Amino acid sequence: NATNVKAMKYLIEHYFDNFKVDSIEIIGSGYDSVAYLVNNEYIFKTKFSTNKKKGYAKEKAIYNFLNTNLETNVKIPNIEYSYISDELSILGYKEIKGTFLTPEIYSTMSEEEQNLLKRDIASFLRQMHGLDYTDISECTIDNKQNVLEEYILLRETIYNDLTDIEKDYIESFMERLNATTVFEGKKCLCHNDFNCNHLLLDGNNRLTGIIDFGDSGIIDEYCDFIYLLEDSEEEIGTNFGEDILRMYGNIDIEKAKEYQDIVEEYYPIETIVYGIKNIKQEFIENGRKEIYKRTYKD
Ligand SMILES: Nc1nc2c(ncn2[C@@H]2O[C@H](COP(=O)(O)OP(=O)(O)NP(=O)(O)O)[C@@H](O)[C@H]2O)c(=O)[nH]1
Ligand SMILES: [Cl-]
Ligand SMILES: [Mg+2]
Ligand SMILES: [Mg+2]
Numbered sequence: 133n134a135t136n137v138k139a140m141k142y143l144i145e146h147y148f149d150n151f152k153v154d155s156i157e158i159i160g161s162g163y164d165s166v167a168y169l170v171n172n173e174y175i176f177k178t179k180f181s182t183n184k185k186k187g188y189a190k191e192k193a194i195y196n197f198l199n200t201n202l203e204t205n206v207k208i209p210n211i212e213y214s215y216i217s218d219e220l221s222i223l224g225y226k227e228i229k230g231t232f233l234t235p236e237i238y239s240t241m242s243e244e245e246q247n248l249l250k251r252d253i254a255s256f257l258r259q260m261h262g263l264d265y266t267d268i269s270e271c272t273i274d275n276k277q278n279v280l281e282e283y284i285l286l287r288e289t290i291y292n293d294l295t296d297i298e299k300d301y302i303e304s305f306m307e308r309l310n311a312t313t314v315f316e317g318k319k320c321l322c323h324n325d326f327n328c329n330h331l332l333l334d335g336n337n338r339l340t341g342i343i344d345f346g347d348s349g350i351i352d353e354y355c356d357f358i359y360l361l362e363d364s365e366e367e368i369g370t371n372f373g374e375d376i377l378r379m380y381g382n383i384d385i386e387k388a389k390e391y392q393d394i395v396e397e398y399y400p401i402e403t404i405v406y407g408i409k410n411i412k413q414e415f416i417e418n419g420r421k422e423i424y425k426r427t428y429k430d
Pocket of ligand 1: 159160161162163164165166167175177179209226227228229230329332343344345346347
């Protein structure tokens with residue numbers, strides 16, 4: 133543990149001239165990033181070379197755009213330190229204080245506390261989704277087209293070595309992708325990883341902060357409801373997302389659920405593709421296995 137922290141202490145002090153690290157600890161870990169709490173006050177997110185060679189650049193541009201244009205009491209990261217290069221990216225900002233939303237916390241809230249939280253979320257999303265996004269217009273994301281390009285990569289690499297069951301799962305997904313209309317609706321700036329782990333509560337269980345806009349972009353409006361609609365141990369439940377969708381208004385709830393269901397079906401394939409692109413066999417294997425688990429559940 134001690135070594136990462138020393139290297140990152142050194143890099144922070146090298147790239148940010150008058151910054152002094154008096155303490156530093158690991159506060160979280162993606163698959164190709166690490167986040168550090170520094171001086172009990174700053175979050176420093178860091179990444180070395182990956183497939184998204186313009187990744188902390190876009191995230192920074194999004195924080196800048198949102199801090200300029202949103203009118204909200206909800207806090208988001210405000211970037212004070214940045215170093216962006218092919219081989220290394222670092223973003224630093226003051227830690228937003230609060231407690232992450234969890235199923236457990238939610239279930240201790242009164243009905244009225246739950247409603248206020250859902251209203252806060254709906255309000256935040258209505259405001260972000262309504263922003264004129266001309267100034268960040270390079271941050272477009274076309275999920276349907278990305279899937280098509282990922283399927284072509286599969287065809288060019290490992291598809292022919294897959295089993296029939298794996299191939300059928302993929303083709304069956306592609307058929308559904310080609311029949312769906314859920315990519316043809318409203319586009320807007322979305323957080324795009326909007327789940328419990330990114331939502332902070334204050335001491336009254338109201339929404340006080342939102343973090344990790346690392347996958348944000350201009351994309352289908354439905355994107356931001358996918359995790360709020362998820363029925364799993366890590367998320368609150370389908371009821372929660374439905375109620376939020378009703379409060380948000382002016383959105384087709386059945387298509388939001390179809391969008392969620394298609395992204396969920398894609399997940400094993402997304403996992404395999406991640407493995408191909410980043411030369412990690414473990415992910416290719418996990419995705420293929422997941423296909424068998426899903427095929428045999430019913
Ligand atoms: N309290 C608090 N925790 C934060 C804050 N920023 C980050 N964290 C913590 O640090 C973890 C990692 O931060 P995050 O932006 O989500 O990065 P990531 O998902 O690991 N990386 P990537 O965006 O590169 O895939 C979060 O899950 C959360 O635990 C903050 O402002 N306040
Ligand atoms: Cl494999
Ligand atoms: Mg995160
Ligand atoms: Mg992220």
